[PDB]
Amino acid sequence: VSYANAVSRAAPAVANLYTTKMESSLGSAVIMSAEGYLLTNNHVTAGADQIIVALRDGRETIAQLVGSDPETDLAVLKIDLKNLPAMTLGRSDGIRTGDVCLAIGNPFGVGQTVTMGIISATGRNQLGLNTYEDFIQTDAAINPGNAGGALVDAAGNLIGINTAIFSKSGGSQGIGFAIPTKLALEVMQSIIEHGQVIRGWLGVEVKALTPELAESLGLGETAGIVVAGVYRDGPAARGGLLPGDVILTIDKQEASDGRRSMNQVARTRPGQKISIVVLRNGQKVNLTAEVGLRPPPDGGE
Amino acid sequence: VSYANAVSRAAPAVANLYTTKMESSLGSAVIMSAEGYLLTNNHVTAGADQIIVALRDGRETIAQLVGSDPETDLAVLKIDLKNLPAMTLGRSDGIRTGDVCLAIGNPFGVGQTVTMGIISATGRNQLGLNTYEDFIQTDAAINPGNAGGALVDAAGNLIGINTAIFSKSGGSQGIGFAIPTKLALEVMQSIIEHGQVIRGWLGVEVKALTPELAESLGLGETAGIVVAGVYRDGPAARGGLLPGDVILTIDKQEASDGRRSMNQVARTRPGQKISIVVLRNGQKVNLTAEVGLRPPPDGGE
Amino acid sequence: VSYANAVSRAAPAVANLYTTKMESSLGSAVIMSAEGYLLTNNHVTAGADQIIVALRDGRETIAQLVGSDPETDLAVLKIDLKNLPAMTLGRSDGIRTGDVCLAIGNPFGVGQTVTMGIISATGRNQLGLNTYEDFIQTDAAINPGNAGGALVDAAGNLIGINTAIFSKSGGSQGIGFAIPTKLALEVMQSIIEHGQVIRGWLGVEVKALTPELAESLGLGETAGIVVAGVYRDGPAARGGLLPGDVILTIDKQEASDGRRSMNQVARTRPGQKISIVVLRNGQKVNLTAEVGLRPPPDGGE
């Protein structure tokens, strides 16, 4: 078959990044709107003193950093250039494992490069790369230099931002990871608006429901989550939260799973008052907390 | 195009294996029947003291070892679990080089992972990995952790058990090897029945027909095989067989090729009397032997 | 889908190469005509004392070296054998990035091997591998042992000669390079005719038009090329050419780009008189030169 039409569609909207820092390094980025906004990875541009964007048509320009988001490994850039080709968006929840995809980037600085593979899996958290993980996995060859570039579906629509690989060799072994478009678009929109992403911030821990601690517990291996360990000087601290008490309920929503609950708390607004309930065998043990702002906190695992 | 339907079909019947031994290691396995029998590689489970099977639906269970077959690198496991999804079988002789295939496994423990490539070649013996080799070769990315998992055709039917790779880097370089379904089903059936595979056993050697030894020989570079070297205390020993005499005929079938003849002898039954003929320029030199049982004897070449 | 028909078409015309030198090494080659001419890489056969060709059908024969071309990394071999299968030719300019292709070779000596990927990019010069570069890039897995073998389109027609890879691991990371058929056929035809390729030869340098040297220059960042540095005892030497003067015109054609101009000079005939113009702010500064012959001057970058 051929993916030429998909490449023709998407490749004009993928650029090369050349960054100098204290010294030179390489990457990719995706043009998201004709106004000149670009998505790339945080680790590509972090601390850079100059960022050059090189387009497929040959034009080069210096970019400005709009803002960056280390906890998803994303960053937004802005350029001032006319008649820019923008990427079409795919549906990252609309993808299935086994669908064909294309990676577009600048591996090893050889030039813009298209590789092909399939969606190997979706929803990869537990990789231990970023705080907020939801990776698409792909076997399209992805190498140092691909970071910040496009993962595209078989029609050329954007489904992710290529980010990381797992390798024992320094280069592709067919296990690569892209940030899904749905996550990346959120981050991008908020950075454009507020210079960063405003998360609901707690300063608290939580880990899995081990079986024997909840064995004695009346419920049976589901529908709850075990808590421990607490950060200090912040609102859970001031709200009476503390290592060892277990969390039934935060903002009235049961925090049954750790990753779910990170997200919910993340999608809250700082300064707001919300109630929190620590463990007792009954319904509640009632605390309150003022939602704070969370401070500030091609890769290979 | 998309392979999503093929993945939907086959992925439920591929499990993760977690084994502890004297210490923890990882692998994959394929559910072959709703009764709970699973195929995997011998090297994954060999000497394990505990074997956990983790299904795509989230269920986990301990497995029992039915039996194992080091000389093909296969092993059979059994689990006790209801409403199990079983793999459909493909036709491993029905495949052609250039057909698309999918590998399903747990590379590096990242999670169940689907990779895509083509049949690169079939019939790979001479790899020097197992005594009985007939590998399918594939460029679908295959890594440590894939061993024991499924190679599937473009419709999701099982064509092989992923086993080994050739790499200079510790991970996929696009040269991987799967045990064909036709071989694996034989092994599986006999292990389920007899706890191992019963081979016809000789205790004898044989190597290629070098050209100048058979130059003088009247026949012309075909249709025969040169012999040498003999194991002892066993039936060829007791049958009057010995290093240096060349084999015309075993069980009346001319042993013209070494790998062919291994197989024939393998598919004989121990305790049976069969006749053997050593080299002389005429028709025969007649010995007899009682067929013995052959004793006990993700990988990277 | 399946590429079996494409493999059936092309694989008979791809051979294994086994070369002994002062000691044994491996490679591939492509049968280009039924007369027994074969293309492979220069680095595979360079300095070999014996070259064996092994065909897919099992026939083996010794090959003769027709001639070789180090500056494109190509070499031509000849064998004497009947009923030979010849490769069909594709159109290497007719390919688009994103088209599917197949690599056919003998990676690591495992046997003839087919791998699949896409055209990742075309026109790769600046790799620094050969003097005359125009590589097709592909993510079809290509390993040591693939050099001299076929890159084929989805219908099995020849589009290139697999040559090199970029890797940090000694094997495929999905960045491989093939010499396009259009270049390779030229080289092959001239070697068959004249034992080598006759290039137009100058003995002179040239590098890019830096911006500030041509800033002051009236023209604006296009349509010219800056010169420097000169080889000696040869015709530019005898023609009055020299480091520092900048070249407007060679054989009346403006030498605006370095790689273009190499080619033009290459496609000229030795012994011919052609005029050359060095830099002055006006039209010309007029020299003459007698075109000389250029003397004599799976890889991993």
Residue numbers in the entry:
A (entry chain A), B (entry chain A), C (entry chain A): 53 to 74, 103 to 377, 386 to 389
Task: Give me lines lifted from the publication on this model.
AlgW, a membrane-bound periplasmic serine protease belonging to the HtrA protein family, is a key regulator of the regulated intramembrane proteolysis (RIP) pathway and is responsible for transmitting the envelope stress signals in Pseudomonas aeruginosa. The AlgW PDZ domain senses and binds the C-terminal of mis-localized outer membrane proteins (OMPs) or periplasmic protein MucE, leading to catalytic activation of the protease domain. HtrA protease is characterized by its trypsin-like catalytic domain and regulatory PDZ domain; the catalytic triad was surrounded by several loops (L1, L2, L3, LD, LA) but, usually, in an inactive mode, and could be activated by sensing a specific molecular stimulus. The catalytic triad (H123, D153, and S227) sites are located between two β-barrels and are surrounded by activation loops L1 to L3, LD, and LA (named according to DegS nomenclature).
In order to elucidate the structural basis of the AlgW reaction mechanism, we prepared the periplasmic soluble domain of AlgW and its inactive mutant AlgWS227A. Protein samples were mixed with two types of peptide activator (tripeptide WVF, decapeptide SVRDELRWVF) prior to crystallization trials, yielding four complex structures, AlgW-tripeptide, AlgWS227A-tripeptide, AlgW-decapeptide, and AlgWS227A-decapeptide, with resolutions from 1.8 to 2.6 Å. AlgW-tripeptide and AlgWS227A-tripeptide crystals belong to the P6322 space group. They have only one complex in an asymmetric unit, and their overall structures are similar (the root mean square deviation [RMSD] value was 1.07 Å). The AlgW trimer could be generated by symmetry operation, and similar to most HtrA protease, this funnel-like trimeric organization is mainly mediated by the N-terminal protease domains. Because of the high flexibility, our AlgW-tripeptide and AlgWS227A-tripeptide structures, as well as many HtrA protease structures, lack the LA loops. Consistently, AlgW-peptide bound structures also demonstrated different interdomain orientations, in which the joint angles of the PDZ relative to the protease domain are AlgW-WVF (25.62°) < AlgWS227A-WVF (25.74°) < AlgW-decapeptide (25.47 to 26.48°; average, 26.13°) < AlgWS227A-decapeptide (26.65°). Thus, by recognizing additional C-terminal residues of the targeting protein, the PDZ domain of AlgW adopts a more open form and maintains a more stable state, generating stronger substrate cleavage activity. This is in accordance with our enzymatic assay in which the tripeptide-bound AlgW is partially activated, while the decapeptide-bound structures reflect the further activation of AlgW.
